[PDB]
Design a protein around this ligand. Sequence first.
Ligand SMILES: Nc1ccn([C@H]2C[C@H](O)[C@@H](COP(=O)(O)OP(=O)(O)OP(=O)(O)O)O2)c(=O)n1
Ligand SMILES: *P(=O)(O)OC[C@@H]1CC[C@H](n2ccc(N)nc2=O)O1
Ligand SMILES: [Mg+2]
Ligand SMILES: [Mg+2]
Length: 342
Amino acid sequence: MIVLFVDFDYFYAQVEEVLNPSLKGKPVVVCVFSGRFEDSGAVATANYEARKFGVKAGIPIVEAKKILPNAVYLPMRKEVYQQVSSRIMNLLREYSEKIEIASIDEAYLDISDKVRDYREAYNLGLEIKNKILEKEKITVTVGISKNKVFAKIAADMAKPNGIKVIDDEEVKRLIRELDIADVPGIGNITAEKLKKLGINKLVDTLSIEFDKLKGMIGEAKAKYLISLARDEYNEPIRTRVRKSIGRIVTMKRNSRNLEEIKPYLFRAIEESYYKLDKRIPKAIHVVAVTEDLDIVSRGRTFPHGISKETAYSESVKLLQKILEEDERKIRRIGVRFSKFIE
DNA sequence: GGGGGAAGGATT
DNA sequence: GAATCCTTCCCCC
Ligand SMILES: Nc1ccn([C@H]2C[C@H](O)[C@@H](COP(=O)(O)OP(=O)(O)OP(=O)(O)O)O2)c(=O)n1
Ligand SMILES: *P(=O)(O)OC[C@@H]1CC[C@H](n2ccc(N)nc2=O)O1
Ligand SMILES: [Mg+2]
Ligand SMILES: [Mg+2]
């Protein structure tokens, strides 16, 4: 089994770059402006020029403008990015039908039946980068290894516009030396608590009693890390669809008033049914964000499809429940749709 | 005993 | 901040 993983370089910022020639060699920061106070919101993506001075995804915009005030700041245009992404993934499909589109900026190809060894895979990867650059002017990084996780790790390593093979000797070395925080699917909440116990490398995961590990990070992550350190991670490359679509918006202050909150909620529904195409969800969640970092939701699932008009009524009810079962005022309001037909 | 569903939590 | 996916828990056949 040979896996070829493809990840798009600083993707939202790079698409803005391709579109706007007046930008490339400068620092570029793609943001989501919550539209509240001036410069309210966060950084979604920054190019490498911007990253050098500390500005990266998830930091507050006002923070990015202190450590790098003169950069070019741009609002997120997710639909533009999604159009480009869709085109590149159709390019990817041509190299393998065994493809796992994991997110808007990355995918896994099972190229086992296509190539006989890592040398041929590396040439294939080069051909893939070349065609994506040619057709879309977008640089990508390719990872190649024996399974999905290590192929991504290879891409993580290959910096931007790179390509890298992690062979079998290399996985063994990586199991012992790679930081747990560098493992796909392991975020900082998980990395930090493990690190306090001295669990810093994948191999350490074997040194700790399974039951303690499961009590810390949960059964799934435990087994996941353990399977990695044991060099027996399986999981084939399979077709993936987006499971949920939704809209969450920030309100201009506001509070508890129903008829005040309702107009935002309604817009989020419009946008969510817009983005759903002709998918048809069976479940709906209304999500509100309180006056703190507190996120509260209420949902309902039906034995059938939810018509858009029906989305309206149910979503108000769900909101009524949130308002009734929580005293804090509401800052942001949204809706998520899931459990689609087929 | 194991879906399924709901509510909260974590990752990108 | 926004979008999405993951984790835990409850209940009933
Ligand atoms: N706190 C965070 C972390 C990440 N993201 C988004 C930004 C990224 O565009 C996207 C995917 O993460 P990537 O690490 O792949 O980021 P980039 O594609 O922008 O750059 P790179 O390819 O170097 O990873 O997740 C976000 O919105 N908020
Ligand atoms: P990123 O570094 O570009 O990685 C994206 C991947 C796609 C799926 C997966 N993912 C997404 C969202 C959540 N909550 N959990 C995940 O594991 O990361
Ligand atoms: Mg990327
Ligand atoms: Mg990515």
